[PDB]
Design a binder for this molecule. Structure first.
Ligand SMILES: CC#C[C@@]1(c2cc(NC(=O)c3ccc(C#N)cn3)ccc2F)CCOC(N)=N1
Length: 375
């Protein structure tokens, strides 16, 4: 109910993600680690990459154990490769416990770390299924729950903007971080945090799409992604409707594609011309759904580094819907692993104005929600 030690344990810069402090090895080596619900490895920088403030030094730890196994993780942009081991892991502003966890010691990477950022590793909070190299590599949170009496649950309050903050409550919920009620959507399958979107509204106007399109080929909740990413077909329909609703002002085609910024004189941004975005999610009960609603304050991201400018952070995807920071910053989100469900509630810290607020509302009646999931 109240975990005062863990409130405000997240830091970050706008655009660079949310990180928590962790210690690895004996004696403890302090590192800043990206909180990532879209991956399942605990992967830390372990060599002196010039971009990194700090890195894991295995030679300094008496509790380090080599698994004698390498891992190689490519993607379209670049890669990371590491050496698998285990060591003792602790979270200073988390539960008072010490865990033997898997660590991928990153020894070479490309386009992985961010130049100028204050984190040097990633905490993959998703499930074993998508761990590299395979599901035999037990994820951190699985190790934490197996080795301690920490409840099988964590919650995230990501507070948007140059210095963002928030809370990762590990093993529970802090009721001060949200208003109103939590509403829960089932975790469809334990790999990513997969969920089912059953309906999409732009300013109350239904997009009227076959709800299967909203989840093609999956919908996930991902704190390790900035944007609200929408399947191509859905993105297309959504921007068409956002354009119509905001047609009072015109903007270049590049703005809606994230290829270009738009700027207003300081303090004059016309939030009111931009529509709210509502996602209905599958509820706990047969034929029952609920709705989450975000403002332009979530999807128009301030860009400080130019030479009041904003980027459109709803973008097209071929990996399905990703509910990134654009969604999560509106809400306190409860990753209730024990009950295979994810809870949403209005965040006590979300950015809004005097006219509109982020919202979690229900119940609604939605039929054939099971047909919305992709096979
Ligand atoms: C292993 C791993 C991983 C990644 C991954 C994520 C990131 N995140 C970020 O830089 C980031 C995160 C949040 C916000 C925000 N707000 C801004 N920036 C960087 C490198 C990665 F390889 C792969 C792509 O997707 C996810 N989920 N995890």
């Amino acid at each position: 109910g109240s975990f005062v030690e863990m409130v405000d344990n997240l830091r970050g810069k706008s655009g660079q993600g949310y990180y928590v402090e962790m210690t690895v090895g004996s004696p403890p080596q302090t590192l800043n680690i990206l909180v990532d619900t879209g991956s399942s490895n605990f992967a830390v920088g372990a060599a002196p990459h010039p971009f990194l403030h700090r890195y894991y030094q295995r030679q300094l730890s008496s509790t380090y154990r080599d698994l004698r196994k390498g891992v190689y993780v490519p993607y379209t942009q670049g890669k990371w490769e590491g050496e698998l081991g285990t060591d003792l892991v602790s979270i200073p502003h988390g539960p008072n416990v010490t865990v033997r966890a898997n660590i991928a010691a990153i020894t070479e990477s490309d386009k992985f770390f961010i130049n100028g950022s204050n984190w040097e590793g990633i905490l993959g909070l998703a499930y074993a299924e998508i761990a590299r190299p395979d599901d035999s590599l037990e994820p951190f949170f699985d190790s934490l729950v197996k080795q301690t009496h920490v409840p099988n649950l964590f919650s995230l309050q990501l507070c948007g903007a140059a210095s963002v903050g928030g809370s990762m409550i590990i093993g529970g919920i802090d009721h001060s971080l949200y208003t109103g009620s939590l509403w829960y959507t089932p975790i469809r399958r334990e790999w990513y945090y997969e969920v089912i979107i059953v309906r999409v509204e732009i300013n109350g106007q239904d997009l009227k799409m076959d709800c299967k399109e909203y989840n093609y080929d999956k919908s996930i909740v991902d704190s390790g992604t900035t944007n609200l990413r929408l399947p191509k077909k859905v993105f297309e329909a959504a921007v068409k409707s956002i354009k119509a609703a905001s047609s009072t002002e015109k903007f270049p085609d590049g703005f809606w594609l994230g290829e270009q910024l738009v700027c207003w004189q300081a303090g004059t941004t016309p939030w009111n011309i931009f529509p709210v975005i509502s996602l209905y999610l599958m509820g706990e009960v047969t034929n029952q759904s609920f709705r989450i609603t975000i403002l332009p304050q979530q999807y128009l991201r301030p860009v400080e580094d130019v030479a009041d400018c904003y980027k459109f952070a709803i973008s097209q995807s071929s990996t399905g819907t990703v509910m990134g920071a654009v969604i999560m910053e509106g809400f306190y989100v409860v990753f209730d692993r024990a009950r295979k469900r994810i809870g949403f509630a209005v965040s006590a810290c979300h950015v809004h104005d005097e006219f509109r607020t982020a919202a979690v509302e229900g119940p609604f009646v939605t039929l054939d929600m099971e047909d919305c999931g992709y096979n």
